[PDB]
Amino acid sequence: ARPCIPKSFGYSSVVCVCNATYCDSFDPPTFPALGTFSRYESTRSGRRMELSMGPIQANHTGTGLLLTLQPEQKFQKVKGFGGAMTDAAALNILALSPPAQNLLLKSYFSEEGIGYNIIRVPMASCDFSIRTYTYADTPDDFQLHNFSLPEEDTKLKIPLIHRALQLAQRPVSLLASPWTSPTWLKTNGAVNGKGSLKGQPGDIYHQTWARYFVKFLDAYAEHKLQFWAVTAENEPSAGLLSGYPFQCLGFTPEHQRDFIARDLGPTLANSTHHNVRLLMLDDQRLLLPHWAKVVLTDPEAAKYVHGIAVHWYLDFLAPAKATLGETHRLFPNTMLFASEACVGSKFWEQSVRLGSWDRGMQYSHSIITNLLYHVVGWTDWNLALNPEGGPNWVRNFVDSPIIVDITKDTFYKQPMFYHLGHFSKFIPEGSQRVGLVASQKNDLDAVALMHPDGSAVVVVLNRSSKDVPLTIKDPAVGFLETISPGYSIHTYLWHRQ
């Protein structure tokens, strides 16, 4: 309905400019008839999820790479896609004029947008906050009577969430995660640095911390927001590091194990929020399979864990088979979910690179890798950040799919936004990954999945400079003659009935 107004800032591609009165959007979804396929294409040259169609014939005119859908090879069912509603994000979003605000929320949650169905919510402050604070900073209040939500919640986050859900295409799931607990429950009495919970699992320190979760869920419930799940702790391994710069809370796998077993699990289960799911780890994938082993081989702990939440820093290496692969192999019935993703973390990398194609490619390549290794969902970090990748109270700036320029009541949707959309918009909840074999060695990254209604969706990413002609074969309908342009990403969709 409205295309991308491109704008280059000096990197491999362009970003799409949006403002109070305009923003590139999609038309209502149309489902092409059997025999025809839909293709959404994005390219480093400038194409942005442009819709085109073609025919699925019975003639195989292709003579190069062939990807054949294998509908009967079923894998994990997809939970969803989303990003985090951090203090930083709500701050940047609410700093645009009401109309720009809605165009931005629409870009993410609407069907005219890329249909996010997941929102991660920090439990109080993290580094993408403009100040340190918790929901109960009044010292030694074990009964948690001075527990309350600050303005960041009641004024910024909760209102943006109500609004995203209100514009949301499909149902949205809320995932919560705490960075640090009140400093008076910690061995070091500081929101950051190296320190963990005081005492040992089962004590009053641990019972209070677990209650803090229920208090939180009661608070948000009072605001008419229910959570799908909460994590045991954001990056618990961070608190084991001396000098850790921002809000954290160390836990060793053992500590986490017993904490969940003796405190978190029971507490949640015995409350009105017992249906909320609990995810363990919520830390970098290199800590797997080991963390899973420790926590999950203990049935008192594992009876409470619904899934293993993982994080990743795209600029870094972390072979998936040895981590995500092995973990599935050891605990096939415990879902793997991606809760945080990052780019521009390494000290020399510019936090934000407006229009970076490399960063987009990294996002999709990472979602494909996650999807190929059993992950049921993929959650982005900050929904939006300013041009410097902030605000971040310890200057730990990174990039974000949407960059807000408050001085121009303008926001820019980066290549990452679209690479995320290529999945988020076409892989609804309940979609199930199916097989997809390549006839030969190729430089493409691809993944196929079947919608709940039975329709197909294949995402093909080409991180190479050369075009790769290819045919997709669906044994129930025919062949899709097509081409994967260099530095591009396509999403194909088609009925099978």
Ligand SMILES: *[C@@H]1O[C@H](CO)[C@@H](O[C@@H]2O[C@H](CO)[C@@H](O)[C@H](O)[C@H]2NC(C)=O)[C@H](O)[C@H]1NC(C)=O
């Ligand atoms: C928001 O962005 C739109 C798109 O660039 C701006 O509208 C364009 O403005 C130019 C120059 O005035 C016109 O030649 C085009 O016809 C407009 N395009 C469309 C489709 O409207 C708009 O000016 C921007 N809003 C503000 C407040 O600057």
